[PDB]
Design a protein around this ligand. Structure first.
Ligand SMILES: [Cl-]
Ligand SMILES: [Cl-]
Ligand SMILES: [Cl-]
Lengths: 123, 123, 123
């Protein structure tokens, strides 16, 4: 899984950034069973004032988490994962849930490469 | 809905950036009926010369708009929305349509969190 | 097709960046037959230490390639494309395959705008 994580610059110290990546990665490993190192967390920082809720410019306190996932998981499991992510990030990032957005997109594992290797192959 | 909006740095002033977010958000609210504040617009700026059309490096005058949407809308409505977005951004950004690209991706609303809350839940 | 390409800053010179965009774009044109200029490559640079494999912070030597594609291609063709991309980038970027991740997402061409024009239209 890859998690693009969109955040403002000077908002997450280079530490709660570790706390958050570990939050995401540990929820994922523990709900899905995917081995730790298969879980990538990629932070996309942008200057504050680059997010707009309703066409209103916001401060720097928004976290969007966009997970790119393989198919096969269930509404239920993915619901547990999104909630667990909102929460652990809430703490790790010492930010409140209402600032966290979480979107999962799914993809056939045939079209996902990790470590240069395919997850599922035509074979 | 979340709209990642990819643009070069020093191209959109911190103003036409408001004009564009409002463009996107108002087209969306008015074609789909989603309440204003549920519409997030997230700007991803990169230095100019970071986009390549055909493996040719371009200036800073490209806008890519990547919408992350829930399912259920129609080809028709989404076509109207993409066109309306190309246009209003064309003006707001005082940029021409040929520079704007618009891609919608869809996702079950069960796997979309806004304001820490799920849109549709297992329930 | 659009290829978001996520990379650390001061890792790809403004040259192997051309080499990589051309790598991606030429694999795509030659496996799929899409005309050169329809192939966008968009580089998203972030400071090093912004990627986490397993909740472990990595250097600046990770390339994630996220392709946004129209539907209709096959597991087979897309597998060839992901592999060809991992490889040509491996060389162009003088980086090893284990650092490259490749994820394709698919979208009805009705909801993809290139150059302000729709790929397929309701019509
Ligand atoms: Cl996954
Ligand atoms: Cl939506
Ligand atoms: Cl494509």
């Amino acid at each position: 899984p890859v998690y693009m994580v969109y955040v403002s610059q000077d908002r997450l110290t280079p530490s709660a950034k570790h706390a958050v990546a570990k939050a995401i990665t540990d929820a994922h490993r523990g709900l899905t069973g995917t081995q730790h190192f298969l879980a990538q967390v990629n932070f996309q920082e942008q200057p504050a004032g680059n997010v707009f809720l309703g066409g209103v410019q916001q401060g720097g306190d928004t976290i969007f988490v966009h997970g790119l996932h393989r198919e096969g998981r269930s509404a239920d499991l993915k619901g547990q994962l999104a909630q667990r992510i909102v929460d652990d990030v809430s703490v790790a990032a010492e930010i409140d849930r209402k600032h966290i957005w979480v979107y999962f997109g799914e993809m056939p594992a045939q079209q996902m490469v990790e470590y240069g290797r395919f997850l599922m192959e035509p074979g």
